[PDB]
Design a protein around this ligand. Structure first.
Ligand SMILES: Nc1ncnc2c1ncn2[C@@H]1O[C@H](COP(=O)(O)OP(=O)(O)OP(=O)(O)O)[C@@H](O)[C@H]1O
Ligand SMILES: Nc1ncnc2c1ncn2[C@@H]1O[C@H](COP(=O)(O)OP(=O)(O)OP(=O)(O)O)[C@@H](O)[C@H]1O
Ligand SMILES: Nc1ncnc2c1ncn2[C@@H]1O[C@H](COP(=O)(O)OC(=O)[C@@H](N)CS)[C@@H](O)[C@H]1O
Ligand SMILES: Nc1ncnc2c1ncn2[C@@H]1O[C@H](COP(=O)(O)OC(=O)[C@@H](N)CS)[C@@H](O)[C@H]1O
Ligand code: NA
Ligand code: NA
Ligand code: NA
Ligand code: NA
Ligand SMILES: [Zn+2]
Ligand SMILES: [Zn+2]
Lengths: 429, 430
C-alpha cells in the first residue's frame, strides 16, 4: 500500500557519500549512479508563451548550481536534457490574442528564455527537446502504452491513461511521490495522453485522429528517447511533483513495464514574493530582464546561493532581499581585487619567504575550510553554509594580506581554490 | 634482512581514487594512498641558482606541474606543495668570485630568472618556497638533533658527518632505500657531511661546531621536515637525485624523527637527453629556457613534454626536429577552438532544428567514452601521452561533425568545456 524504492547498487559506481533530498523517498538518501560515474538527468523546461520571471530563474539557477557541483566539484559525468514545451493550451490562447501563429510565438519566447539563462550564467544542457519536433515519437510512445494495456481510446479520438489498470499491476504504483493527491472516461482521475483537437486548434495526425499530446506524455517521451529506461536524476519545481512528475513516472513505467524509471527525483522550492508563489497568474512577478536592469548576475546568483535549493524562499522587493547579496558581492569583488594585485606586484627578488607561524595559521584555516565546504556540498548541496565558510576564510585572508609579509604561493593557491568554488557557484569575478 | 621494507598507508578514512604511481621506494607502480584524508604533502627539489635554467630543468618542473594539476584539478586532492631554492652551494660560491657582484645578489639574480622562466612556461608557484639562506638556523638545530640521537659525529676541523654504520645498525633504519647497490676526518668513506667547516674567504654561517655551511642533503631534509613534518606523501626530483641526495635525505630525516618511513611515495622524473646524452651544463649541450622561448611558445614546449611519459627518459632533437609535431598539435588546437567558437557564435536558436539525431548520439557516445579513457590514463601513473592522443582523436571527430552535421549547440558547448578542463589540467592556454 506504500511505494517501494530501490537504492542502486554501489558496486562499480563512483561513491562520494553525497546525500540528496529524494522526493521518491521523502528523505535525504545517498546518491549512487546507475552506471559508473555517469548521471543521466532530465529537467522540465519552460512553457514558452511569455517572458521568464525571477521564479523561473530560481529553479534553473538552482539546478545549474547543482549541476556545476556535480560536474566541476565532484567530477560526475552529467548528460543533461532540458525540454521546451512549445505546444500548450497557454501558447495556443496567447497566439490567437496576439494574432501570431503558435510556432512564431513559441520560438520568440524560447529565444528570450535562453538569452535570460545566458545572462544569468546558466549552462545550456547537452540536449534541448522541443515537443513540436518529437510529436511522431510521442505517438509511437503512446502506441506502446496502449499495447501494454495501460491506455485506452475514447470514441472522440483521445487517448487516456488507465489508472486503475496501472495500479492493479503488482509492479506498478500510481502517484509514488504524492500518493494522497489522488464522462467519456473509465475513471475521472484518468489523464489524457492524446487530446482530440478541435478543428481550429493546431493538431497532428495519429492512429486515433487529429490531436495534440497531453502535457505529461511529452516529457516521458523526450526523456526516454534520449536518456533511456533509467534516469539518474529528474528535476523540476515542487509544483510539478504532482500531477506532472508522478504522471510521467506512471507513463514511463507503463512504456518500459518496469518499476523505477527515475532513481532520484529532485524538486526545487518555490520563490515567493509577499508570501505567494511568484506567478504570472497572480501578476506579482519580476521578469529576469527587469531584474537585470537593477542587479547583476552575480548578485542574483548570490540570492539563490543563500537559500537552500529545496526549501521555499521569500523575496522582499524594493531591494530588501538584495541588500545582503550586494554586500557579499562587494566583499568578493574587493577581496579579489587585493589578492590579484598582491600576486601581480609581488617581487621575488626582494622578499623574504620563510614559512612563519602566521603563514602556517592561514594555511591550516585554508585546508580546514576546504574540508568544511566538502561536507556542505555532500549535505544535499548546502550552498548557504558553503558560502559562509568562504566569507569567513576571506575575512582572515584580508587580515593576512594587510599585516603579514605574504607567502606568494600560498596566496596563489588560495586564489585558485576560491576561484574553483566560485566557478562551481557560477559567479564570475 | 638486507632488503628495505615499504609500508603502504592504510586505506581507512582516505580518499581512494585507484591512482597508481611509479614509486622509487618499491621500484614498481603501486596504489597511491594519502597519509591523511585527501591531503598530499609534497616536497620537490628545486634549482641550484647560479646560472640560467635549461630545457632539462624545464622538463622536470613542467612534468611535476602537470602532475600537480592532475592531482588538484582532476582528482580534487588537497596538495600542500613545497619547492626549495638551493642558494648556498659550491657552484654559487665559485661563480660569485668570477662574477664579482656578491654572493647573495648572484644567487637571488638566478633565482629570479628561474621563477621568470617558470612563469613563462605556465608553471604554478608552490605553496611554500624554502631558501637555504633563510633556513640555516633551522638546519643547525636539525643537525644538533641528529647528533643527540647518535647518528652524526663532529670532526676536529669543525665539520659534522652522518654516521652511516650507526644508522644501519638500528633495526628500524635502512641506508640507501632506493639505490642499495650504489653504496681522513671520517670513520668511513661513505659518511657524508651535514656541516662543512668553512675555508677562508668563502661565505659562512655560525654553528656550535664552528663557522661553516650546510651540506647539500641536510638542507632539503631540514626544510621539508620544517614545513611538512615527519611524513611526506610525495617527495620528487630528477632521477639523478635518487642517489645519493634523496637516499641521504631519507637517512637524515629518519635519524631526526627516529622512525622508518619519512616519505611514502618517491617520484623521479626522467632526464631529457639531447643527441643521446643528458642535457647538462657540464656537457655544453644545453638549451636555455629563454632561448627556447624565443623560438617556441609555452603551449608548444608543454606539448613536447606531454608527449613523453614523465618518468621515462626522452630524446630531444634540436633545430626544430622534435618541435615539428608539437607545433602541428598546437596549431590544430588553436584552429579547433577558432572553429567551434564560430559555430557556437553563429548558431541561431530561432531557425534551428534540435532533434537529437543519430549523428548527435554517436558524437555523444564518443565524448563519454573519451572521458573514461582519459580517466584510466591519468590513473595509470599520469599517462599524458595517451590522454593527449584521446583528446586529439575526439577533436578530429568534432571537426567532422561541425563541418556537415546539423549541430547540437549544447553538446558542442559541453564538449568544449570538457576539453578546456583537460587543457587547464595540462597547463595549455587557448
Ligand atoms: N572522472 C571520471 N571519469 C570517468 N569515470 C570515472 C571518473 N571518476 C570515477 N569514475 C568511475 O568511477 C568508478 C570508480 O569506482 P571504484 O573505483 O570504487 O570501483 P572498483 O570496485 O575499484 O571497480 P572498477 O574501477 O573496476 O569499476 C569507476 O567505474 C570509474 O569508471
Ligand atoms: N574533495 C575533497 N575535499 C576534501 N576532503 C575530501 C575530498 N574528497 C575526499 N575527502 C576526504 O576523504 C576522506 C574520506 O572520504 P571518502 O569519500 O573516500 O569516504 P570513506 O572512504 O567512506 O571514508 P569516511 O566516511 O571514513 O571518511 C574524508 O576525510 C573526506 O574529508
Ligand atoms: N515561483 C517559482 N519559483 C520557483 N520555481 C518556479 C516558480 N514558478 C515556476 N517555477 C518553475 O519553473 C519551471 C518552468 O515553469 P513553466 O510553468 O514555464 O513550465 C512548466 O512547468 C512545464 N513547461 C514543464 S514540462 C518549472 O520547473 C516550475 O516549477
Ligand atoms: N637534463 C635534465 N632533464 C630533466 N631533469 C633535469 C635535467 N637536468 C637536471 N634536471 C633536474 O632539474 C632539477 C634541478 O636541478 P639542479 O641541478 O638545478 O638542482 C639540484 O639538483 C638541487 N638544487 C636539488 S635540492 C632536478 O630535479 C634535476 O634532476
Ligand atoms: Na500495484
Ligand atoms: Na502540484
Ligand atoms: Na638496519
Ligand atoms: Na645519481
Ligand atoms: Zn515536464
Ligand atoms: Zn634537494
Amino acid at each position: 500500500s506504500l511505494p517501494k524504492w530501490n537504492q542502486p547498487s554501489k558496486e562499480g559506481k563512483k561513491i562520494t557519500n553525497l546525500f540528496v533530498n529524494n522526493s521518491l523517498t521523502h528523505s535525504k538518501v545517498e546518491f549512487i549512479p546507475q552506471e559508473g560515474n555517469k548521471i543521466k538527468w532530465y529537467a522540465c523546461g519552460p512553457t514558452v508563451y511569455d517572458a521568464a520571471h525571477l521564479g523561473h530563474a530560481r529553479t534553473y539557477v538552482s539546478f545549474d548550481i547543482i549541476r556545476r557541483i556535480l560536474v566541476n566539484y565532484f567530477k560526475y559525468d552529467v548528460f543533461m536534457v532540458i525540454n521546451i514545451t512549445d505546444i500548450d493550451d497557454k501558447i495556443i490562447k496567447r497566439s490567437v490574442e496576439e494574432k501570431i501563429g503558435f510556432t512564431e510565438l513559441a520560438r520568440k519566447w524560447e529565444y528570450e528564455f535562453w538569452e535570460d539563462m545566458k545572462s544569468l550564467n546558466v549552462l545550456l544542457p547537452t540536449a534541448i527537446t522541443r515537443v513540436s519536433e518529437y510529436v511522431g515519437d510521442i505517438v509511437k510512445y503512446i502506441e506502446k502504452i496502449i499495447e501494454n494495456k495501460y491506455a485506452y481510446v475514447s470514441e472522440e479520438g483521445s487517448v487516456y491513461f488507465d489508472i486503475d489498470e496501472f495500479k492493479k499491476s503488482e509492479k506498478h504504483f500510481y502517484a509514488r511521490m504524492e500518493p494522497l493527491s489522488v464522462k467519456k472516461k473509465k475513471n475521472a482521475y484518468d489523464f489524457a495522453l492524446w487530446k482530440s483537437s478541435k478543428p481550429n486548434e493546431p493538431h497532428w495526425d495519429s492512429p486515433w485522429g487529429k490531436g495534440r499530446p497531453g502535457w505529461h506524455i511529452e516529457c516521458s517521451t523526450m526523456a526516454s528517447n534520449i536518456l533511456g529506461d533509467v534516469l539518474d536524476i529528474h528535476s523540476g519545481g515542487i509544483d510539478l511533483r504532482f500531477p506532472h512528475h508522478d504522471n510521467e513516472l506512471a507513463q514511463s513505467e507503463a512504456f518500459f513495464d518496469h518499476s523505477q524509471w527515475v532513481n532520484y527525483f529532485l524538486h526545487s522550492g518555490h520563490l515567493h514574493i509577499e508570501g505567494l508563489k511568484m506567478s504570472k497568474s497572480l501578476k506579482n512577478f519580476i521578469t529576469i530582464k527587469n531584474m537585470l536592469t537593477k542587479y547583476t548576475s552575480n548578485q542574483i546568483r548570490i540570492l539563490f546561493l543563500l537559500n537552500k535549493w529545496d526549501n521555499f524562499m521569500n523575496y522582499s522587493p524594493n531591494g530588501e532581499s538584495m541588500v545582503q547579496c550586494i554586500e557579499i558581492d562587494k566583499s568578493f569583488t574587493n577581496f579579489f581585487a587585493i589578492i590579484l594585485m598582491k600576486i601581480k606586484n609581488f617581487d621575488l627578488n626582494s622578499c623574504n619567504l620563510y614559512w612563519s607561524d602566521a603563514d602556517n595559521k592561514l594555511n591550516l584555516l585554508f585546508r580546514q575550510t576546504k574540508n568544511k565546504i566538502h561536507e556542505h556540498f555532500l549535505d544535499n548541496f548546502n550552498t548557504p553554509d558553503a558560502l559562509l565558510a568562504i566569507q569567513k576564510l576571506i575575512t582572515e585572508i584580508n587580515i593576512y594580506m594587510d599585516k603579514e609579509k605574504i607567502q606568494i604561493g600560498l596566496l596563489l593557491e588560495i586564489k585558485h581554490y576560491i576561484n574553483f568554488i566560485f566557478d562551481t557557484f557560477g559567479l564570475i569575478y
